Structures are given as C-alpha cells and as structure tokens.
Design a protein around this ligand. Structure first.
Ligand code: CHL
Ligand code: CLA
Ligand code: CLA
Ligand code: CLA
Ligand code: CLA
Ligand code: CLA
Ligand code: XAT
Ligand code: AXT
Ligand code: LUT
Ligand code: LUT
Ligand code: LUT
Ligand code: LMT
Lengths: 221, 219, 41, 231, 165, 207
C-alpha cells in the first residue's frame, strides 16, 4: 500500500492508521492515538508542534548565523537574559503576563475551533477563519485554516495535487525541525555552544569532534 | 438565541436563554440554574451595578476635577477620615446608624417588591403615594416616582436598549471599583495617579512591580 | 487508549493522584510560605 | 506556446491557455494556481515592472549626470529644496490617493474610471492594469507586442535594480563604476573571485556600506542585506 | 492583653526562647566548615528560625508566661483586639474550602445517580464531569443557600427508610 | 458610496434621500436604529450650527485682534477671554446663560418630542412648521425654493465648521498662538510646520 516506518511487519501498523492522514507511515508502537478523539487531538498537536518547532529552529539558526558574523545578536540559550539586561525598564513578570495573555487569546480561538470545527468563522471574524478541514474527513476547521489571511498566496486553493504536496512538505519539515530542536538542546547541554558553533567546529575537524569527545555523552571518555 | 456570546463557539446554557439584559450566556459555575435564584441574582446584579456606578462616579469625577484644579477633595480612601477630624463632625457610629435606619425602610420595601412586584401599590398603604409604587412587572425597574423624565417609555424595544446600556455600565463600574480597591491596597495612590504612572512606563509600572500582587516569597 | 484512560480514572489511581497533588501543593505552599501560624492578610 | 522559460518542458496546468503578456510558463511554486491570485499577482508584477524601470533609469541618469553622488546614500546626501518631513507627507498623501484608486480599479474594473472634479471627463473602458485613454496618448505599434516589450523590460529592470543594490553593498560604487571595475579585470572582479566557501574556510567580502548613517539629528541603520548570509 | 497575656514583642520568655534556639543551632554549626553543605544547611535553618520569631513578634501574636504564642478563639474578643486572623478568619477559610469539596462530591454523586449504572461511575470516576463539578463547587455557598430556600436540598422524611422502632 | 466610490451604502442610508448631506458614510453603523438616526440628525444639526457660530466668532475676534479694529476687549486670545472684565462676573454670566439656554432648549426638546406641537408663543403668535430639525425661523423666506440645496449647503458648512473647531482646539493644545497665527506660521515655510514637527502629535519623535 504505502511506505511504512518499518518495512514489512504489518502487525505493528495500527488499524486506525489507514493512510488517509498526511505523513501517515503506520508509526504508533505505543498506541497513543488508539482512540478516535485522541487521534484527532494528537494530529492537531503534531502539526502545531511542527510549525512551532520550525519557527523556533529558523530563529535560532538565523540568530546563531548573525552571532558568528559579529552582530550584536546573542545566542538562543542566552537571548532572554541578554535582552533583559539591555532593557532594565522591562519587568520580567510583565513580559511573561503579556505573552501569556496574547497567546491565550489566539490559543483560545484555536481551542474553540478544535471543540467546534466551524464556530470562529463568524461574529468578529470573516468566513475565512472557518477552516478547510482535512483530517478525519472534515470539511471545516482543523489545523489547516485556509482563507485570505492564513494563506494569502492561495497555495492550497487550486489543484488538490499541489495542496497534498505542500501538506507533505509541511509535515516532513515540521518533524525534521522538532528533531532539530531536540538536537540543539542536547548539543547545548553537552558542549555548551550554539548550533552553528558545533557545526563549524565539527566541519573543521571531523574526527575528534563527535558526540564521544564532548565529555558528556560518554562520561568515561 | 444567535446573539453574541461571551465565548464564541460555546453554546449558552439553557437556563439563561436571551431575554434578560446583558445576557451573554456567561455562567461557568451554573449559579443561576434555579429560576428564583436567577431572579434574585438579577436583582442583586442591578443593585450592585447601580451602587458601583454611583461610587465610581463619586470617586473618579471629583478626582478628575481635583487634578485639573477646580474643586479640591481628598482621595477616596482618606475621604472618610478627613471628615472625621472636622469640627462639627457627626460621630461615625451615629452617622452609620442613621444611614442604616433609613436604608432599612427603603431596602425592606424594595425587598417586598422583589417577592411581589405590585406589593407596594396596595391601596391605603401610604398617604396616597402608594399608587406610584407599582412596578413595571419586573422587579428592579420601578417607574412612577422613579424615572421622572420617562426615558425609554416610547416603546418596548427602546426600554430594552437602555436596559442593556445600564447593565453594561453597571458591570464596568463594578469591575472598576474592584480595581480601585486592589490598586489602592497594592499601591497607596489614587486611580488617576496609577493611570498616569502606568502610561509613563507601562513595562516598568504595573501590577507585576507593585510588590503586593506577586508575592516576594516566590521571587 | 480508551481502556488506559479508563483504568487511570479508577478510584485507587484517582485517589493516589489526588492525594499526591494535594500533598505536593501543600508542601510547596509551606516551602514558599513557611511557619504560617495565623492567617495574616 | 513555443516560447518557454525551459525549452522542452511543459507549461503548468494553470499557466496553460495563459493570455497574460510575457507568459512563458514559469511557476515552479504554483503561486498563480488560483485565478484571483493570478490576476492580483499580474497587477503586482506590472506595477513592479514600471517602478523598477523608472528607478533603474533614474539611477543610471543620476550617475551619468552626477558621478560624484552615490545613489545608495543619495537619500541623506543631496540637500533637499524642501523639508524631508513635508516632502514625505505630501508624497504619502498623493501616493495614497493614486494607489488606492488603482487598487480599487483592480478589485472592481470600472469603479475608478470617472473624474471626481470634472464630471464630463471619464476614462474609457479598458483592461485591468492598463488604464489608457489619457494615460496612453501615444501608442507606436500594436498593443500586444508593446505589452510584451513592457513586461520583458520590466523584468530585466527588476533584476538590474537587485544587481545595482548588491553591487553597491559589495563594492560601494555606482552601477557604471562597478561595470568599469569589472571590465578592467574580469578574472578577479566576479563574485566567484571575491567570495568562496569550503568545508573549513569561508571568504566573505567586507561591507562597503557603513554600519549606520547619520541623517539630520537621528541615526538610520542602512547596513548590508543579510551580511551573515553572504558567501 | 486579653486574658492576662503579654504580646510576644514585649515577652522576655519569647526572646529567651529565640536566643536559645539560635544558640543551639550555632553550637551545632561550630563543628563544620564555612562553605560546606552542612554549614550552609545550618545557616539556612538559623535564618528561618530568626525570620519565624520576627514574624511572630511582628504579627501581634499573644504570648503567655511560657513564652509561646496563644490563639484567641472568640469573635468580638478577637475582632476588637486585632486577633481575627487566629481562629475567625481561618474558620471562614476552612468552612469555605470544606464546603467546596463537599458540594462538589454531592453534585457528582447526584449527577451519576441518574445514570443507568451508577456504581461503576462511583468506582470509575468520570474525570471531565468531576472536573466541571469541582469548578462549580466554588460557588457552593450561593448554590447551597438557593437550594435550601428552594427546598430541593432536603429529602422528605416520609421518603427515607427507617428502622421498625 | 458618495464618500467612497469603492464602498457600499449601509442600507439604512440608501432609502433616506431627505437627509441633508447623505453620502452613505456610517462605517460604525451608529444610525442603524431609526430612532438613533433620528436623534443623531438633530444632534448633528445642533453641533454643526453651534460650531459654525463658535468658529465664526473665534475667527472674527482673532482677525480683529491681529489686524486691529476691536477695542481692548478684542485685543486678546480667544482662550484668554477670562482675563477680560465685562458688566457681570463669570458666575453671573454662567447662571444667566444656564437659565436662558434651559428655556430655549426645553422649547426645542418639546418640539422634538412632538413635532408641530410647541409652535405657538404665549401671546398667540404662530409660525408654519416645516420638518423637525427645521422649525421654520425664516424671516427672509429663503426656503420657498431649492430647500434641499440650501439645507445641503448648511450641512456641509456645519460639518466643515465642526472640523475647524476641533482643529483649532488641537492646534491650541499643540501649537502656540491664535489660529490665524498658526496659519501664518505654517504658510511661512510650510514644509516644516505641520504637526509632524510640533513635538506633540507624533509623540514618538523627540519624546
Ligand atoms: C520607495 C523606494 C526606496 C528605496 C528602494 C530606497 C532605498 C534606500 N534608501 Mg530611501 N529608498 C526609497 C525611498 C525613499 N527614501 C527616502 C529617504 C531616505 C533617507 C533620508 C535615507 C534613505 C536611505 C536609503 C537606503 C537605506 C539602506 C538600508 O539598508 O536601509 C535599511 C532600511 C531602513 C533603515 C528603513 C526600514 C523601513 C522602511 C522600509 C519603511 C537605501 C539604498 C538611507 C541611506 O542613504 O542609506 C545609505 C537614508 O539615510 N532614504 C525617501 C523620502 C524622500 C523616500 C521616498 O520614497
Ligand atoms: C509532540 C510532537 C508530536 C506529536 C504530538 C505527534 C503526533 C502523531 N504522530 Mg509524530 N513524530 C514526531 C512528533 C510528534 N508526533 C517527530 C519529532 C517525529 C520524527 C521522529 C515523528 C514521526 C512520526 C511518524 C513517522 C508518524 C507519526 C505519526 C503520528 C500520529 C500517530 C501517532 C500517535 O498517535 O501518537 C502520538 C504521539 C505523542 C502523543 C507524543 C508522545 C511523546 C512521548 C509521550 C514522550 C517521549 C518522546 C521521546 C521518545 C522522549 C524525548 C523527551 C525528552 C528527551 C525531553 C500522531 C497524530 C504517524 C502518523 O500516522 O502520522 C499522522 C506516523 O506515521 N509521527
Ligand atoms: C485539625 C488538625 C490540624 C490543624 C488545624 C493544623 C494547622 C496548622 N498546621 Mg499542622 N499538623 C497536624 C494537624 C493540624 N495542623 C498533624 C496531625 C500533623 C502531623 C502530620 C501536623 C504537622 C504539621 C507540621 C510539620 C506543620 C504544621 C503546620 C500548620 C500550620 C500551617 C498552616 C498552613 O499550612 O499554611 C496555609 C495553607 C493554606 C492556605 C492552604 C489552604 C488551601 C488548601 C490547599 C485547601 C485543602 C483542600 C483539601 C497550621 C496553623 C506548619 C506550621 O508552620 O505550623 C505553624 C508546619 O510546619 N502541621
Ligand atoms: C461559641 C460560644 C460563645 C461564647 C462562650 C462567647 C463568649 C463571650 N463573648 Mg461571643 N460570640 C459568639 C460566641 C460565643 N461568645 C459568636 C458565634 C459570635 C458571632 C456572632 C460572637 C460575637 C461576640 C461579640 C461581638 C462580642 C462577644 C463577646 C463575648 C464575651 C462577653 C459577652 C458575654 O458573654 O456577655 C453576655 C451574653 C449575653 C447573651 C447576655 C464572652 C466571653 C463580647 C466581648 O468581646 O467581650 C468584651 C463582644 O462584644 N462575642
Ligand atoms: C458681534 C460680536 C461682538 C461682540 C459680542 C462685541 C463686544 C464688545 N465690544 Mg466689539 N466690535 C465688533 C463686534 C463685537 N463686539 C465688531 C464686528 C467690531 C468692528 C466694527 C467691533 C469693534 C469694537 C470696538 C472699537 C470696541 C469694541 C468694544 C467691545 C466691548 C464693549 C462694547 C461697549 O460697551 O462699547 C464701547 C465702550 C467704550 C468705552 C468705547 C464688548 C465686550 C469696545 C471695547 O473694547 O471696550 C473697551 C471698543 O472699543 N468693539
Ligand atoms: C477643518 C479643516 C482644517 C484645516 C483647514 C486645517 C489647517 C491647518 N492645520 Mg489642522 N486640524 C484639523 C483640521 C484642519 N486643519 C483637525 C480636525 C484636527 C484634529 C486632528 C487638526 C489638528 C491639527 C494639529 C495638531 C496641527 C494642525 C495644524 C494646521 C496648519 C498646518 C497644516 C497641518 O499640518 O494641518 C494638519 C491636518 C490635520 C491634522 C487633519 C486635517 C483634516 C483634513 C485633512 C482636512 C482636509 C494648517 C493651517 C498644525 C499647525 O498648527 O501648524 C503649525 C498642527 O500642528 N491641525
Ligand atoms: C515545539 C518545539 C520547539 C519549539 C521551540 C521554540 C519555540 C524556541 C523558541 C526560542 O528559541 C527561540 C526561537 C529564541 C530563543 O532565544 C528563546 C526560545 C524561547 C528558546 C519542539 C518540539 C519537539 C518535539 C519532539 C522532538 C517530539 C518527539 C516525539 C516523538 C519522537 C514521538 C514518537 C512516538 O510518539 C510516536 C510518534 C508514536 C508513539 O506511539 C511512540 C513514540 C516513539 C513515543
Ligand atoms: C502555556 C500553557 C498553559 C497555560 C495556562 C496559564 C498560565 C494561564 C494564565 C492565566 C494568568 C492570568 C496568568 C498571569 C501571569 C503573570 C505573571 C506575572 C506570572 C509569573 C511571574 C513571576 C513568577 C515573577 C515575579 C517577580 C518577582 C517576585 C520579583 O522579585 C520582582 O523582580 C518582580 C517580578 C520579576 C515580577 C496551558 C495550561 C493552557 C497549556 C500548557 O500547560 C501550556
Ligand atoms: C458573573 C459570574 C457568574 C459565573 O458563573 C461565576 C462568576 C465568574 C463568579 C461570576 C462573576 C462574578 C463577578 C465578576 C462578580 C464581581 C462583582 C463586583 C466587582 C461587584 C462590585 C460591586 C461594587 C460596589 C457595589 C461598589 C460601590 C462603591 C461605592 C458605593 C463607593 C463609595 C465611596 C465613595 C463614593 C467615595 C468615598 O470617599 C469612598 C467610598 C465610601 C468607598
Ligand atoms: C515569478 C516567480 C514564481 C515562481 O513560482 C516562484 C518565484 C521564483 C518566487 C518567482 C520569481 C520571483 C522573483 C524573481 C521575484 C523578484 C522580484 C524583484 C527582483 C523585484 C524587484 C523590484 C525592484 C524595484 C521595484 C525597484 C525600484 C527601484 C526604485 C524605485 C529606485 C528608486 C531610487 C532612485 C530612482 C534614485 C534614488 O536616488 C534612490 C532610489 C530611491 C532607490
Ligand atoms: C459621522 C460618523 C459616523 C461614523 O460611523 C463614525 C464616525 C467616524 C465616528 C463619525 C464621525 C464623527 C465626527 C467626525 C464627529 C465630530 C463632531 C465634531 C467635531 C463636533 C464639534 C462640535 C464643535 C462645537 C459644537 C463647538 C462650538 C464652539 C463654540 C460654541 C465656541 C465658543 C467660543 C467662542 C465663540 C469664542 C470664545 O473666545 C471661546 C468660546 C467661548 C469657546
Ligand atoms: C560484554 C561486556 C560489555 C563489553 C562492553 C563494555 C563497554 C561499556 C563501557 C566500558 C567503559 C566503562 O569503563 C571505563 O573503562 C575505561 C577504559 O579502561 C576506563 O578508562 C581508563 O582507562 C583508559 C584506557 O584504558 C584511559 O585512557 C583512561 O584515562 C582511564 O580512565 C574508565 O575509567 C572506565 O569508566
């Protein structure tokens, strides 16, 4: 049928993963999405995590590249402290409260859309914020929100093949970005340097600059 | 039915529907499930909103005038003490008892009106003034003596709009008074002073830096 | 997944989790606000 | 048609039967898949073409007439007859009027075709993005070939402007000055001669534009476009 | 002074107790280094002890002949002498939280009692329903008073089973 | 659509051709309710006429103060009229104004409640009523013909005067001198003096 996360072995592939979902490879050994509503919730969480990880990884990479060039851009693991230091008039609690409030407003809009697929496409919002659906055969709401604001270029409007290709691109890049952020955290905790720093130090000296020489992954070495 | 709700996408509870002014389907605690309890809470909301509106007006307008220069009055938290040290100042206990004695009569009469709207219109109750004590059918909206200018009497929809404006203003004033209390307790300054201090440096002057809202033990 | 969540909703599991959460909250309250003999507001 | 951006390839489905001028079937990302978006992008491309043509011509003429003035820093080194604030406000007001009229004409074809002051004058019927009438008092040749010429020249002008800004940020000289510098040593003045990256070392040309520029009493950033990303 | 009690601020026994506790802690601290873990722990304990004694003396607590704080459990007596936070306010706080938990449990039991299989709902709790009822239990005073004045908070004596005397 | 060729009339203003200066301008839909629009029309007429009188007075007084025609009373800024001394103090004048305005405004309100009712004076004199916001005080009989055109002129001049008064107050709170002095200071360059460099409106520029 479709490519699996483990060639052959159809027993490990769950029944609820029939291949209709984007990025479906039958991966669910722990059965964390056995329930239907749990599967829908996990789909929303996965796409949201992928987009958030892509944004964070892109920002971290760009800041690390700027820091290497000599710009007054701090590293990702110290950007918050640095900004708080150059701006002593900004209260940390105030910034946290503002972030929580604004994120709460948008997250509540998304949450209500999750509860009711097409309930936010009216009132104080146009029909564009109603969603186009997709997962679980839905035709409204979901993580894929079309419209003229979340898709100004209209890449998903016209030719379903292009829409499917872009959706696969998005999910694959999101998973890759999630793994990239995990690697960023592990590398910072082991070597204490940024991503670009680790990459340049490794390219300069391939052998002697692996995870075994950081002194953290392999303790006795 | 399809009127705006407090949380878009969430269906309003069946016990609220959409007839009372200010009905936005907001009842996460399901406090107004009982009809009698809902009616009592509606009357309580109207009373609290009107009293809060009067208090917030008497606290903001005099403060705004004082800031300009005309009409010099003390800050609302010190107004009670300022009058106490006056020469012919009435004792606090006597003043409070007189106010409570008058309020006892008026509030008990309003209480009887809540149980039965046409209660106070009983013939012979007063010296011919009971005729003007008949409500409009809903407790909390008594015409006659009250509403001497007859605003909103042109039609039923006109009165409904005014009721919505009254409920929104009352709720806003209630929240404003709670804010006044919290602001003065956290910062020993007036509302206008707090507003002016916040605009000067919003990121450095707010509830996160007053030292009271956020406990110092956590930090 | 449904059966697992149903098992987690059983009386013993919920009782232990609730007791653990309440105990943890009380421990942290006493850690940040220790020696609270009276209700000083 | 036979004119393709990639000979031997196949035009995209949405770009087939494309009547837009200068349509050579170039759309790898499929940005013109939607019909409405295609028209909006066509108007955007035409306006970009004309603006880039005007800008490139102006920069070249300014360099020829005044070779001692750097076009990149001309915004803060020209000595304005008026004031920068008043000039910006006047330009913003008139630009808002004209741009709003044009955009609304695109949204609704014949909505912005009547003179508001003189009721007797009205722009004749035309196609979106091509006003005509009083705007085109002289047409030397057929409209289709001239439209193709305009689109091609505009695309070339946009690429020319990008090359101008990049050469100014890398060499700090004017367009013709950089061209003369490249002519004096073609094998040493190319981007491959100044920049090169290898697994272990990277040579990035230094910025020829100051980090910050002082205008009037304030400071303006004006540095390099993603210098850290330069090869 | 309420019942022959002296404020802890002016109590000599209170100060002597604080001094003795700090003295014992310092005696134990003397057998360690200056920056070692036991030394830091003992110093933290000393700081906590001093802060506790200072807070008790500053809060206005009353101390007896033994030098230990005493609580006044009597409205009026505690309200006029500034001791409402000893038992009065804690009483209100408890009553509120206890009623909250009790009302939440009562509502959950009554809601699941209408289900076709209530015993299973009792051994296998409905987490979403329990969460909603726990949140609704915060308005327990208003709800309880409304139910009492409504007559739905009680069961008729003629409908409750009773022994044959 | 009159105020914007790309906009649409908010429906409640499409079938209302009897309103002076009806350009379909109501982006906030404040006049959707017929009663609300009826009250807003009277409010607009009152504000516009009062603004016309006030702006004309301020302009004439400042013109006489600058060129030099009025006595010591005119030789003063409009906002500084309190320094002048008249026949009665400020309190007496304010009280007299309150009483006279109470009488006139109550007559107008009675007419608003029931148009055509209050139209007779205590001495029996009567006038012909012609629409609500137009009581008929036309001693020159200028409304006999082209009434719609005349009221359109009135509404446009009223709106212009309202904007003029708002601008005068804003300029006074942001720029020094009289409105005519501000106009002259502007016309002096005028590429530098234009609220952008006043140091008050932008706020973000030079604090
Ligand atoms: C509309 C197109 C237009 C373009 C392509 C440019 C391009 C440029 N201008 Mg110009 N300007 C333009 C319009 C105008 N400028 C000015 C007034 C100025 C001044 C006063 C200055 C420039 C400067 C600059 C340069 C800034 C370089 C940089 O990295 O800046 C980074 C970008 C910013 C700091 C602004 C970001 C926000 C902005 C896009 C809105 C650059 C080559 C500066 C210069 O000489 O640099 C060497 C400079 O000092 N411009 C006016 C008002 C008359 C314009 C009106 O249309
Ligand atoms: C939090 C991020 C996240 C979330 C919510 C999901 C969610 C989902 N994934 Mg996905 N995945 C992710 C990250 C995520 N994934 C990453 C980073 C990769 C790259 C390795 C993949 C690769 C992948 C494949 C190949 C497939 C899926 C599939 C699915 C769907 C079915 C699986 C399921 O139901 O279990 C739900 C998953 C969770 C509830 C996450 C549980 C996390 C556990 C509890 C923590 C342990 C994680 C890790 C081992 C420990 C590191 C933590 C520590 C170091 C800090 C589901 C909607 C299948 C599918 O059909 O796609 C639609 C499928 O074929 N995923
Ligand atoms: C009915 C018996 C009873 C009562 C009334 C108290 C009362 C008190 N105890 Mg005590 N205690 C008891 C039994 C009791 N205890 C028993 C049986 C033991 C042996 C395990 C202890 C062991 C003990 C220790 C070791 C300590 C206390 C402390 C305290 C005080 C801290 C108050 C607090 O936690 O801050 C405020 C807490 C809140 C505001 C939380 C309220 C909201 C909760 C979460 C609601 C709970 C809903 C369920 C308080 C006056 C502490 C103290 O400092 O003494 C002065 C302390 O160190 N107790
Ligand atoms: C639980 C039983 C109880 C007991 C034994 C007491 C005992 C006492 N109360 Mg008290 N009180 C109680 C409950 C109780 N109260 C409750 C529930 C309230 C809340 C309504 C109050 C509110 C209260 C106030 C406001 C005052 C007292 C006062 C007093 C003291 C003198 C009054 C008196 O008894 O004179 C005789 C009582 C007759 C009925 C006669 C006395 C020791 C007074 C005090 O503080 O002493 C100076 C004081 O003014 N109480
Ligand atoms: C229609 C609006 C208006 C109003 C409300 C006023 C009001 C006033 N004018 Mg004025 N005036 C006006 C129009 C107006 N004027 C116009 C249009 C002109 C130009 C023709 C003048 C020319 C004028 C002069 C020359 C003088 C006044 C003076 C005065 C003040 C005293 C008048 C007096 O008692 O006689 C005059 C009293 C004398 C002692 C002489 C008074 C407050 C007098 C004044 O300023 O008081 C000292 C004065 O000298 N006015
Ligand atoms: C009623 C029409 C009207 C006219 C003819 C003027 C004319 C003038 N104004 Mg003014 N203004 C107006 C309305 C008007 N204003 C309104 C309604 C406001 C409130 C927002 C202002 C607020 C204002 C300020 C704060 C300032 C001026 C200033 C000025 C002068 C310089 C030009 C300028 O920057 O204006 C600005 C125009 C506007 C802010 C909006 C005008 C409304 C439209 C565009 C009218 C057509 C100039 C003579 C400046 C000055 O005093 O000169 C030194 C000055 O600082 N105006
Ligand atoms: C969201 C995310 C990262 C987002 C990062 C952000 C916003 C970073 C933000 C900032 O950096 C900037 C930009 C600037 C900095 O100065 C400050 C911060 C604030 C730091 C990563 C998620 C990262 C998420 C990851 C890595 C998830 C991995 C999950 C896996 C592998 C699960 C696999 C399985 O679950 C399945 C699928 C099926 C099951 O049955 C079996 C198992 C095996 C359990
Ligand atoms: C994200 C997210 C969740 C979040 C839910 C929240 C959080 C809702 C918030 C409500 C409010 C209203 C928060 C106010 C949030 C406001 C604030 C201010 C919070 C924390 C601030 C602190 C602890 C710092 C204090 C300081 C100390 C004491 C000092 O010493 C001085 O320097 C001053 C100062 C620096 C201020 C979720 C459940 C949806 C889902 C996931 O689980 C995740
Ligand atoms: C709805 C609901 C339902 C659901 O279900 C649940 C929940 C959530 C709970 C909810 C909510 C609620 C709320 C919010 C409440 C609040 C209230 C208030 C605030 C009130 C006030 C209220 C308020 C008020 C009355 C007030 C009043 C005031 C006053 C008189 C004042 C007075 C004064 C003055 C003048 C001056 C002087 O010098 C001082 C004084 C003496 C001070
Ligand atoms: C088509 C497509 C589709 C597919 O699918 C995908 C993709 C690939 C994405 C695509 C492509 C794209 C592209 C290529 C783009 C580009 C563009 C440009 C370049 C623009 C410019 C554009 C440009 C422009 C406008 C420019 C302009 C200019 C100007 C005005 C100038 C001005 C000036 C002058 C005169 C002089 C002075 O002293 C200075 C200044 C002021 C400076
Ligand atoms: C339409 C609409 C609708 C949509 O939907 C929305 C929106 C947009 C909101 C809108 C708009 C609105 C507006 C604009 C308004 C405004 C108004 C005004 C400005 C008024 C004034 C108004 C104004 C006024 C009355 C004024 C008046 C004045 C006066 C009397 C003056 C007096 C005087 C004089 C003679 C002289 C002296 O020495 C001083 C004095 C004593 C001071
Ligand atoms: C079948 C049984 C399992 C076979 C594989 C087991 C491998 C698992 C990890 C083994 C490493 C852990 O054991 C580790 O041994 C190394 C190698 O001697 C010791 O290392 C020591 O000797 C090495 C070289 O011999 C020196 O360079 C080093 O300075 C010294 O510390 C570590 O101190 C000890 O921690």
């Amino acid at each position: 049928v479709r490519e699996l996360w483990f060639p052959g072995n159809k027993e490990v592939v769950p029944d609820y993963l029939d291949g209709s979902l984007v990025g479906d490879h039958g991966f669910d050994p722990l059965g964390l999405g056995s329930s239907p509503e749990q599967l829908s919730w996990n789909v929303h969480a996965e796409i949201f995590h992928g987009r958030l990880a892509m944004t964070g990884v892109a920002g971290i990479l760009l800041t690390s590249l700027l820091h290497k060039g000599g710009a007054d851009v701090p590293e990702w693991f110290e950007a918050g402290r640095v900004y708080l230091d150059r701006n002593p008039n900004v209260d940390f609690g105030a910034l946290l409260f503002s972030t929580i409030v604004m994120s709460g407003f948008v997250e509540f809009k998304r949450l209500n859309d999750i509860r009711n697929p097409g309930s936010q496409g009216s009132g104080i919002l146009p029909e564009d914020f109603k969603g186009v659906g997709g997962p679980q055969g839905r035709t409204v709401g979901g993580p894929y929100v079309g419209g003229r604001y979340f898709d100004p270029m209209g890449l998903c409007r016209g030719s379903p093949e292009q829409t499917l290709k872009y959706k696969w691109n998005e999910i694959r890049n999101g998973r890759l970005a999630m793994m990239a952020f995990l690697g960023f955290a592990a590398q910072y905790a082991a070597t204490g340097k940024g991503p670009i720093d680790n990459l340049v130090d490794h390219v300069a000296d391939p052998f002697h600059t692996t995870f075994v020489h950081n002194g953290v992954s392999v303790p006795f070495i | 039915a399809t009127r705006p709700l407090w949380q878009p996408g969430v269906e309003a509870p069946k016990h609220l529907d959409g007839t009372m002014p200010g009905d936005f389907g907001f009842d996460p605690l399901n406090l107004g499930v009982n009809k009698e309890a809902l009616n009592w809470y509606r009357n309580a909301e109207l009373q609290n909103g009107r009293w809060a509106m009067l208090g917030v007006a008497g606290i903001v307008i005099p403060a705004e005038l004082t800031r300009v220069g005309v009409l010099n009055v003390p800050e609302w938290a010190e107004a009670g003490k300022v009058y106490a040290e006056s020469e012919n100042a009435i004792p606090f206990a006597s003043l409070l008892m007189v106010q409570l004695f008058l309020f006892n009569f008026v509030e008990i009469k309003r209480w009887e009106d809540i149980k039965k709207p046409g209660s106070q219109a009983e013939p012979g109750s007063f010296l011919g003034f009971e005729s003007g004590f008949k409500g409009t059918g809903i407790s909390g909206y008594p015409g006659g003596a009250f509403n001497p200018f007859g605003l909103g009497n042109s039609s039923k929809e006109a009165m409904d709009d005014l009721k919505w404006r009254e409920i929104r203003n009352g709720r806003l004033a209630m929240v404003a008074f709670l804010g006044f209390l919290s602001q003065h307790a956290a910062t020993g300054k007036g509302p206008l002073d707090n507003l002016a201090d916040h605009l000067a440096d919003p990121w450095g002057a707010n509830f996160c830096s007053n030292g009271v809202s956020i406990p110092s033990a956590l930090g | 997944m449904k059966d697992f969540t149903t098992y987690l909703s059983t009386a013993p599991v919920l009782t232990l989790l609730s007791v653990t959460v309440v105990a943890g909250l009380l421990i942290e309250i006493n850690r940040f606000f220790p020696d609270a003999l009276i209700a000083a507001f | 048609a036979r004119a393709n951006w990639l000979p031997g390839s196949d035009f995209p489905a949405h770009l087939e039967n494309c009547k837009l001028p200068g349509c050579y079937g170039f759309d790898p990302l499929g940005l013109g898949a939607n019909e409405e978006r295609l028209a909006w992008f066509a108007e955007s491309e035409r306006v970009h073409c004309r603006w880039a043509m005007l800008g490139v011509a102006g920069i070249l003429v300014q360099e020829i007439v005044k070779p001692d003035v750097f076009w990149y820093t001309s915004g803060a080194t020209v000595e304005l007859p008026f004031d920068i604030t008043g000039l910006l406000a006047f330009e913003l007001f008139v630009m808002h009027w004209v741009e709003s009229r044009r955009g609304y004409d695109i949204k609704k074809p014949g909505s912005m075709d009547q003179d508001p002051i003189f009721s007797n004058f009205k722009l004749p019927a035309h196609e979106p993005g091509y006003p005509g009438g009083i705007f085109a008092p002289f047409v030397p040749g057929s409209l289709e070939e001239l439209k193709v010429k305009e689109i091609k020249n505009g695309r070339l002008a946009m690429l020319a402007f990008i090359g101008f800004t990049m050469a100014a940020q890398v060499t700090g000289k004017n367009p013709l000055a950089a061209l003369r510098e490249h002519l004096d040593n073609p094998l040493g003045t190319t981007i491959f001669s100044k920049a090169v990256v290898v697994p272990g070392q990277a040579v990035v040309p230094p910025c020829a534009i100051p980090d910050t520029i002082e205008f009037q009493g304030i400071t303006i950033p004006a540095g390099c476009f993603l210098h850290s990303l330069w090869p | 002074d309420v019942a022959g009690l002296t404020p802890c601020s002016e109590s000599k026994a209170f100060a002597k107790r604080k001094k003795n506790e700090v003295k014992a802690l310092n005696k134990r601290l003397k057998n360690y280094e200056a920056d070692s873990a036991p030394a830091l722990a003992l110093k933290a304990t000393i700081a906590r002890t001093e802060a506790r004694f200072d807070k008790y003396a500053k809060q206005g607590l009353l101390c007896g002949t033994d030098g230990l704080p005493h609580l006044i459990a009597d409205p009026g007596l505690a309200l006029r002498y500034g001791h409402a936070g000893d038992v009065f306010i804690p009483t209100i706080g408890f009553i509120y939280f206890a009623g909250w938990l009790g009302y939440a449990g009562s509502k959950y039991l009554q809601a699941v009692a209408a289900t076709a299989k209530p015993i299973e709902k009792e051994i296998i709790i409905d987490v979403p329903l329990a969460w909603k009822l726990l949140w609704e239990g915060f308005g327990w005073p208003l709800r309880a008073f409304a139910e009492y004045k409504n007559g739905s908070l009680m069961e008729d004596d003629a409908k409750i089973t009773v022994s044959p005397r | 659509a009159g105020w914007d060729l790309s906009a649409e009339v908010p429906a409640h203003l499409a079938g209302r051709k009897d309103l002076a200066g009806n350009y379909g301008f109501d982006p906030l839909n404040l006049g959707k309710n017929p009663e609300a629009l009826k009250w807003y029309q009277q409010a607009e007429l009152q504000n516009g006429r009062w603004a016309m009188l006030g702006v004309a007075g301020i302009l004439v007084q400042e013109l006489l103060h600058s060129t030099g025609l009025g006595g010591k009373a005119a030789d003063v800024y409009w906002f500084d009229a309190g320094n002048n001394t008249f026949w009665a103090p400020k309190e007496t004048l304010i009280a007299i104004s309150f009483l006279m305005f109470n009488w006139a405004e109550l007559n107008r309100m009675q007419d608003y409640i029931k148009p055509g009712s209050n139209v007779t004076d205590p001495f029996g004199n009567k006038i012909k009523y012609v629409e609500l916001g137009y009581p008929g005080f036309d001693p020159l009989s200028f409304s006999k013909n082209n009434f719609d055109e005349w009221k359109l002129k009135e509404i446009k001049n009223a709106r212009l005067a309202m904007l003029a008064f708002l601008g005068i107050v804003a300029q006074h709170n942001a720029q020094p001198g009289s409105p005519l002095e501000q106009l002259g200071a502007h016309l002096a360059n005028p590429w530098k003096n234009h609220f952008i460099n006043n140091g008050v409106s932008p706020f973000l520029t030079d604090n």
